[PDB]
């Protein structure tokens, strides 16, 4: 059966055309899928029985299942999500004015950022469209579908879970298209963010395919530091990355002219005032908003968390040059908030097989 969660609107329409149906019936089913979080054709009461029959035979709505759920006292929900025989992470971060979902792009990552827990697993495989948009679908279903509760469960999506999104463009783009779609999650392009450590030619490609808000994982003020911290910089250095960012801003207006810059704060590595002065000079040619992120520790990482006084002085230096800078709040502090940790060791895979036999 075809998983309808693999298809954007164009493809949904083409599939329904092959079923002998008019294109607007695809729109109607999408609306059921995403506005109501319906995965059951019998529940789609305004579709005729004949179409329901076709769909039950040749199609399905199969979203990844939750295998673990952690609920923070601050409202954050962290899910381990089953994708085949593997696990990825999806995180729901509520606020009064907002609700952000952090979504994974790959099982593991091949980029080897030393401060990232997902790096130490390595790269396993790319997620399919259904496995990416399906995280939004599952989260929406659990939190409460928009037309069920009368409130949009998710106002904001960030591709900031496990994996490098620019290395899964084939699947990440259609998934984001569904997020943007009126018949999908109806999100504004300003409210869908793709974060990247800087796969430069893939970023040039992204710009030709879709217009979404861009965030860059910079984490260093110069090349010698960034080579160490984020090793893809050895392939495409800061200047190459920043030039690509400028080219993207020419094609896209989701950022409203200003790229989001992510900067993780690693104790006595990239968090000094001397690093802040260098960063300020580095970014003089690129319009931006700077997010300083306290590093989230995990066992065996060769870094420490920067103290809040060191982070605050770093921020003051940046603000003295007139940069819009924001120190991000730690969310879900009472739970396993470090990216990649809840979908931990891949060796537990065999143990899961054995577990299911006893069930
Ligand atoms: C997990 S990555 C996924 C998207 C893309 N690969 C990237 O690096 O931007 C999303 C963001 O999480 C950050 N990150 C990873 N591990 C972290 C940790 N332990 N503490 C704080 N931030 C972390 C990275 O710096 C990156 O900006
Ligand atoms: S920070 Fe991003 S690019 Fe680096 S290893 Fe983690 S998921 Fe991959």
Curated annotation (Swiss-Prot):
Example of a GO cellular component annotation carried by this entry = cytosol
Instruction: Enumerate the Gene Ontology biological process terms.
Output: response to antibiotic; rRNA base methylation; tRNA methylation
For the keyword Transmembrane helix, the answer is: no
Enzymatic reactions: adenosine(2503) in 23S rRNA + 2 reduced [2Fe-2S]-[ferredoxin] + 2 S-adenosyl-L-methionine = 2-methyladenosine(2503) in 23S rRNA + 5'-deoxyadenosine + L-methionine + 2 oxidized [2Fe-2S]-[ferredoxin] + S-adenosyl-L-homocysteine; adenosine(37) in tRNA + 2 reduced [2Fe-2S]-[ferredoxin] + 2 S-adenosyl-L-methionine = 2-methyladenosine(37) in tRNA + 5'-deoxyadenosine + L-methionine + 2 oxidized [2Fe-2S]-[ferredoxin] + S-adenosyl-L-homocysteine
Query: In which residues is S-adenosyl-L-methionine bound?
Result: 163-164, 195, 217-219, 296
Record keywords, A-Z:
4Fe-4S, Antibiotic resistance, Cytoplasm, Disulfide bond, Iron, Iron-sulfur, Metal-binding, Methyltransferase, rRNA processing, S-adenosyl-L-methionine, Transferase, tRNA processing
Q: What is its main location?
A: cytoplasm
| Gene3D superfamilies found in the cross-reference section | 1.10.150.530, Aldolase class I
- EC number(s) from the headed UniProt entry: 2.1.1.192
Active site, renumbered: 89, 339
Q: Name one Pfam family in it.
A: RlmN_N
Q: Where does [4Fe-4S] cluster bind?
A: 109, 113, 116
Q: Which CDD domains match?
A: Radical_SAM
GO terms for MF: 4 iron, 4 sulfur cluster binding; metal ion binding; rRNA (adenine(2503)-C2-)-methyltransferase activity; rRNA binding; tRNA (adenine(37)-C2)-methyltransferase activity; tRNA binding
Q: What class of enzyme is it?
A: transferase
Q: How is the cofactor bound?
A: Binds 1 [4Fe-4S] cluster. The cluster is coordinated with 3 cysteines and an exchangeable S-adenosyl-L-methionine.
> Which branch of life, at top level?
Bacteria
The knockout note for this entry states:
Cells lacking this gene lack nucleoside m2A in both rRNA and tRNAs. Inactivation of rlmN produces an error-prone phenotype since it increases the misreading of a UAG stop codon, and thus decreases translational accuracy. Also leads to increased susceptibility to tiamulin, hygromycin A and sparsomycin.
Localisation: Cytoplasm
Intrachain disulfide bonds: 102-339
Cofactor requirements of the protein: [4Fe-4S] cluster
Q: Which family does it belong to?
A: Belongs to the radical SAM superfamily. RlmN family.
Described by its record, this protein's role is as follows:
Specifically methylates position 2 of adenine 2503 in 23S rRNA and position 2 of adenine 37 in tRNAs. m2A2503 modification seems to play a crucial role in the proofreading step occurring at the peptidyl transferase center and thus would serve to optimize ribosomal fidelity. Unmodified tRNA is not a suitable substrate for RlmN, which suggests that RlmN works in a late step during tRNA maturation.
PANTHER family associated with the record: 23S RRNA METHYLTRANSFERASE, RADICAL SAM CORE DOMAIN-CONTAINING PROTEIN
Q: Any extra detail in the entry? A: Reaction proceeds by a ping-pong mechanism involving intermediate methylation of a conserved cysteine residue. In details, the methyl group from one SAM molecule is initially transferred to Cys-339 in a typical SN2 displacement. Then a 5'-dA radical formed from a second molecule of SAM abstracts a hydrogen from the methyl group of mCys-355, and the resulting Cys-appended methyl radical attacks the substrate adenine ring.
| Name of the protein in its database record | Dual-specificity RNA methyltransferase RlmN
**What organism, scientifically named, is this protein from?**
Escherichia coli (strain K12)
What lineage is this protein's organism placed in?
Bacteria, Pseudomonadati, Pseudomonadota, Gammaproteobacteria, Enterobacterales
Quote the gene name from the UniProt entry.
rlmN
């Amino acid at each position: 059966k075809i998983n309808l969660l693999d298809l954007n609107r164009q493809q949904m329409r083409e599939f329904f055309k092959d079923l002998g149906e008019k294109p607007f019936r695809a729109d109607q089913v999408m609306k059921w899928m995403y506005h109501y979080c319906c995965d059951n054709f019998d529940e789609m009461t305004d579709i005729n029985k004949v179409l329901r029959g076709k769909l039950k035979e040749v199609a399905e709505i199969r979203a990844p299942e939750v295998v673990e759920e952690q609920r923070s006292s601050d409202g954050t929900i962290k899910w381990a999500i089953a994708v085949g025989d593997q696990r990825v992470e999806t995180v729901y971060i509520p606020e009064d004015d907002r609700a952000t979902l952090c979504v994974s792009s790959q099982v593991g990552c091949a980029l080897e950022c030393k401060f990232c827990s997902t790096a130490q697993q390595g790269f396993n495989r790319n997620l399919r469209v259904s496995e990416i948009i399906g995280q939004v679908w599952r989260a929406a279903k659990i939190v409460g579908a928009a037309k069920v509760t009368g409130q949009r469960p998710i106002t904001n999506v960030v591709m900031m879970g496990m994996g490098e999104p620019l290395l899964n463009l084939n699947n990440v783009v259609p998934a984001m298209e569904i997020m943007l779609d009126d018949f999908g999650f109806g999100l504004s392009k300003r409210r869908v963010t793709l974060s990247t450590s800087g796969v430069v030619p893939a970023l040039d490609k992204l710009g030709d395919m879709i217009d979404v808000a861009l965030a860059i994982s910079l984490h260093a003020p110069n090349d010698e530091i960034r080579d160490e911290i984020v090793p893809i910089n050895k392939k495409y250095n800061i200047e190459t990355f920043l030039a690509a960012v400028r080219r993207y801003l020419e094609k896209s207006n989701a950022n409203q002219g200003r790229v989001t810059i992510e900067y993780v704060m690693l104790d006595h590595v990239n968090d000094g005032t001397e690093h802040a002065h260098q960063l300020a000079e580095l970014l003089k040619d690129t319009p931006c908003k700077i997010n300083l992120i306290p590093w989230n520790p995990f066992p065996g990482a060769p870094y420490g968390r920067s103290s809040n006084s060191r982070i605050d002085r770093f921020s003051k230096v940046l603000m003295s040059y007139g940069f819009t800078t924001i120190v991000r709040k730690t969310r879900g502090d009472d739970i396993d908030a470090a990216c990649g940790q809840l979908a931990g060791d891949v060796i537990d895979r065999t143990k899961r097989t054995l577990r299911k036999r006893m069930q």
